[PDB]
Structures are given as structure tokens and as C-alpha cells.
Amino acid sequence: SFDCGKPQVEPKKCPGRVVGGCVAHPHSWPWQVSLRTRFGMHFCGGTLISPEWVLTAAHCLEKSPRPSSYKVILGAHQEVNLEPHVQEIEVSRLFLEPTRKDIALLKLSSPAVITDKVIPACLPSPNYVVADRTECFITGWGETQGTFGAGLLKEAQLPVIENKVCNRYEFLNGRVQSTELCAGHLAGGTDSCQGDAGGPLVCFEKDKYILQGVTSWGLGCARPNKPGVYVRVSRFVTWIEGVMRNN
């Protein structure tokens, strides 16, 4: 009986001013997935959106078409030395977005056991445009530019920047389309690609966290004066629903 987007461990909620991010409270981002190689090395992030489905970036599956080449780790906080309670589930089927966007679906060969440390994130209604300045969080392990909290799950607070403004000449110069969204700072931002490719970007709504973006470094990484661009989940909801409904 675990409804999506409601962690059992309340998130640290790293201050926006902390552009370098914070180590997350363990298990406060219950849907955080870690995509792993055949041998067991984390290499990408993803989000649990149902017990049998994980939403990640197409870029993460570029090395192999075989589902058997991927296994997902759920309930983790450590990147290498996982806790014994961590769930490891092999991937049964892969589904890349039909129009070459950096988003893909992985079907778990076995349903995820929903626990207090493993809960699915909620999905936005089709074509919903998250409001300007909404507070969101990107989470993942990725490349820790520091070394403090290295190997552990981290988070960063990023406010959304409406496409109209993000596309201004001094910033993204009109390169951000409807299938994308910007979250971050226009000035005084960190210089680094945050999270894990395929990692989630969730924004709190009424009483739950909604997955509104997927991490894609190709779209653009945070820069001192440039916000990072994310794949807008809402434009692929109808597509995600179909695959889940036919597989």
C-alpha cells in the first residue's frame, strides 16, 4: 500500500543556494534507480514508475540491445558497497523512444518489492507544463566534483526556468523544444553535468513528488550562467502508458 511520490524518509531538501548539492537522506528518494552493467557496475540512473517499469535515458542503452545486459538496483544509497536490503532485478525488455528523444523504458523481469525504501515516483498528466520557478530536485550519484559524500546518493534543488526565458539569446538561444524543460540557474550556477544520465528530476506538487524530467547531458549541462536542460516527461506520458499497456 505505497502510493507514488511519497517517500517515507523525508528529503533533506538541499538549499537552492547550495549549487554543489547535498548528500541525500538515505532512502528519501525511494524511486531512485541505478542502472548496472552485467558485472555489477552502476553506470546510469533511472526512475521506478511502477513495480515492473523503470524510466531512464535512451543514451544509457546505447552499448547493448540485450535486456540481459542490464540489471537495476533499487533501494540503494551507496554506489559500490550496497546495503544487504538492496534489490537487484534483471531487465527483461527494452523500449527506446520512437522519435530519437533521450528517454527509454525498461521492463523488470520481476516486479519490484515496494517497501519503505523502494517506492515508484508519480507521473505527470500528458503535456503538463511544470510552472515557471517550481522547485525541483535532480538526484543521483554521478561524478562527485568534490569527494565529500562521494559514492553516496546526492541531490540538488533546481527551480524550473520556463522555455520562453531559457531560450533567450544569452542562454539556450532557442534550442530548447517542447519536449524539453530547463531547471537551474541563469546566473551563479555550478559548472557540471548533474546526476546520472537517465536520472530523475522530480518536483513536489500538493502532497507528492512528480517526475517531470529525465537527465540528458547532451541537452546541456549546468554552467555558471547556463541552466541544464532535461527531457520533459509530460510529452512522453501517453507513449509510456501505451508501452506499459501492451507489454
How far apart, in whole angstroms, are the C-alpha atoms of residue 203 and residue 206? 10
Count of Cβ atoms closer than 10 Å to residue 27 Cβ: 22
Burial of 88 (0-12, 13-18, 19+ CB in 10 A): middle
Two domains, one topology: 18-29+121-234 and 30-120+235-247: yes
Coil, strand or helix: which one is 91? strand
In the PDB record, what is the listed experimental method?
A: X-ray
Question: What is the end-to-end Cα distance of the chain in Å, rounded?
Answer: 24
- Residue 233's identity, in one-letter code, is V
Which residue has 546541456 as its cell numbers? 220
Neighbours of 173 (CB within 10 A): 10
Structure's resolution in angstroms: 2.0
For domain 30-120+235-247, give the CATH superfamily: Trypsin-like serine proteases (2.40.10.10)
Residue with cell 522530480: 202
CATH topology for 18-29+121-234? Thrombin, subunit H (2.40.10)
Q: Are β-strands 71-74 and 135-140 bridged in parallel, bridged antiparallel, or unpaired?
A: unpaired
Question: Where do the structural domains in the chain lie, given as residue ranges?
Answer: 18-29+121-234, 30-120+235-247
Q: What's the CA gap between 9 and 115, in Å, rounded? A: 12
In Å, how far are 83, 160, 234 from 122, measured between CA atoms?
25, 18, 11
d(CA 56, CA 245): 18
What grid cell was written down for 26?
Answer: 538515505
> Nearest-5° angle of CA 33, CA 200, CA 144?
80
* Residue environment code for 117-151, b if the CB has 16+ CB neighbours within 10 A, otherwise e: bbbbbbbbeeeeebeeebebbbbbbbebeeeeeee
